[PDB]
Amino acid sequence: GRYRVIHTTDMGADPDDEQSLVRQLVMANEYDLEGIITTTGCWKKSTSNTAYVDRILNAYSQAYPNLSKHAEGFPTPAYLDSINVMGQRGYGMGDVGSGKDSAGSNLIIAAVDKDDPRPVWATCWGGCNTIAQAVWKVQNTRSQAQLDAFISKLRVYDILGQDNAGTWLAKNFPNLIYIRARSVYSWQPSDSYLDNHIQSHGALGAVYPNRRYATEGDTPAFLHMANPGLNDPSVVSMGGWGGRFPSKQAGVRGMSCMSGEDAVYDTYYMYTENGESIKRWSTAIHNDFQARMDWAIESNYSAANHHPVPVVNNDANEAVMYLNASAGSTVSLDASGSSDPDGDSLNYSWSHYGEADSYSGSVSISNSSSASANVQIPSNAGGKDIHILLTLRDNGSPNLYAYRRVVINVQ
């Protein structure tokens, strides 16, 4: 019920990285976070220490006693300290190669090598060169088969393209699942929301800085993995809080601080959006962070809201649900069972996520605002899939959401 994620971040380039780390930390019970790596990108080409992260983790240690009363599985402060390390200290592929290992690059290697069947995500909040150093070292020291196996267990989520090393990865390792997300600017909350709901809330709020340019431009790089019941982030066409990536595109260019650098790698492909795809989730996203900052400052469970818990057809697993059904049949999807741990009331909303599925037509859902819905599988849907989403919403303060996607493979 959790995904494995390692973040690499160019702390100091812009306050948004700090903002993003605060949100990730109050969401950390939903993940297996395995690295917080301070590194570079074209907006911050040199770095020397982890002091930004140290400061934020000190705040986390003050919030952790409260956070841990609100959900299971928050990582300990000691554990987070252990995975707070330096990555590459210089820029791009110019800091990749012989003698250039970092704590962060080695951390990535060790995570990918681990005997956990789950893949691991490595992200680029700045450049991707700490990931590139890891892959370069594996390529330089292991067999082809061992390199292919390594690549098969990795995924990269690159925000915007901020060094030439991400491009080097996409070009040289075409079997690596690689997203270069660019439509990361349309979902953000207001500065007043931040002041009132976030920054005022205790020690973690005090290390959440104001926006300089954009708020939390890098945050999609973990929201992609926030909701196992909504989306499998390795199926990048599904859509979810990190966006929807329907195809690979050629020559996806990075930011202006690396102009001219991508082109030497042509032709290369990267998954990227074909349409902004985060804003649709914004209400849920904003309410989520609001409630979690309440968790951070309330010592009593009773004093904050917690997410509702979906069940569909007596299946309580926090994962995408897969069903096979015949064309021209009706499928009952019953979310009775679902619960709320605060005793809130629930609202049920069923939708056809037609952007995400291979069926080209429309799909009728009866009683789509009720717990117990019925999906009409078209007679012409054979050989396609149909994605049906349950969105569950409580009436707590603020309203919190939960999801279950049902993927119906039609015969």
Residues numbered 341-360 forming contacts with Cl ion, rule: CB under 5 A: 355
Interacting partner of 183 out of Zn ion, Cl ion, Ca ion, none (Cβ under 5 to 8 A depending on kind): Cl ion
> What is the per-residue binding string for Ca ion in 299-318, x denoting contact by CB under 5 A?
------xx------------
Binding residues for Zn(2+): 201, 294
Burial class (CB in 10 A: 0-12, 13-18, 19+), 179: buried
Q: Answer for the pair 284, 401: CB distance below 8 angstroms, yes or no.
A: yes
Q: For residue 270, what is the enclosing H or E element?
A: strand 269-272
Residue nearest to Mg ion (CB): 239
Q: Which stretch binds Cl ion (CB under 5 A): 31-39, 241-249, 315-323, 329-337?
A: 241-249
Q: Answer for the pair 307, 338: CB distance below 8 angstroms, yes or no.
A: no
Pairing of strands 365-366, 321-325: unpaired
Interaction between residue 163 and Mg ion (CB under 5 A): no
Interaction between residue 17 and Ca ion (CB under 5 A): yes
Q: How far is the CB of 400 from Zn ion (least distance, A)?
A: 13
Interaction between residue 357 and Mg ion (CB under 5 A): yes
Interaction between residue 239 and Mg ion (CB under 5 A): yes
**Pick 165 or 377: Cβ nearer Ca ion:** 165
Q: Which stretch binds Zn ion (CB under 5 A): 89-97, 210-218, 244-252, 289-297?
A: 289-297
| Phi, psi (rounded to 5 degrees) for 403 | -135, 150
Q: How far is the CB of 185 from Zn ion (least distance, A)?
A: 25
Interaction between residue 294 and Zn ion (CB under 5 A): yes
> What is the per-residue binding string for Ca ion in 334-363, x denoting contact by CB under 5 A?
------x-x-x-------------------
Cis before 215 (ω within 30): no
Distance, in Å, from the CA atom of 47 to the CA atom of 11, rounded to the nearest integer, reads: 8
Pairing of strands 177-181, 154-159: parallel
Binding residues for Mg(2+): 199, 277, 354, 357, 359
Q: Which stretch binds Ca ion (CB under 5 A): 74-82, 126-134, 173-181, 280-288?
A: 126-134
Distance, in Å, from the CA atom of 279 to the CA atom of 284, rounded to the nearest integer, reads: 10
Cis before 189 (ω within 30): no
**Of 396, 402, 405, 407, which lies in the binding site for Ca ion, with binding defined by CB under 5 A?**
396
Q: Which stretch binds Zn ion (CB under 5 A): 43-51, 106-114, 151-159, 194-202?
A: 194-202
What residues does 122 pair with on adjacent strands?
6, 156
Task: State the number of CA atoms in the 13 A half-sphere of 167 facing the CB.
Answer: 25
Distance, in Å, from the CA atom of 273 to the CA atom of 239, rounded to the nearest integer, reads: 10
Distance, in Å, from the CA atom of 296 to the CA atom of 299, rounded to the nearest integer, reads: 8
Rounded alpha-carbon distances, angstroms, from residue 358 to 246, 281, 361: 11, 22, 9
Q: Which stretch binds Mg ion (CB under 5 A): 65-73, 172-180, 277-285, 299-307?
A: 277-285
Interaction between residue 19 and Cl ion (CB under 5 A): no
Q: Answer for the pair 26, 62: CB distance below 8 angstroms, yes or no.
A: no
Eight-state DSSP code of residue 16: H
**Of 46, 76, 141, 186, which lies in the binding site for Cl ion, with binding defined by CB under 5 A?**
186
**Pick 205 or 396: Cβ nearer Mg ion:** 205
Residue nearest to Zn ion (CB): 294
Which residues of the chain form contacts with Cl ion (CB under 5 A)? 183, 185-186, 239, 244, 276-277, 355
Binding site for Zn ion (CB under 5 A): 197, 294
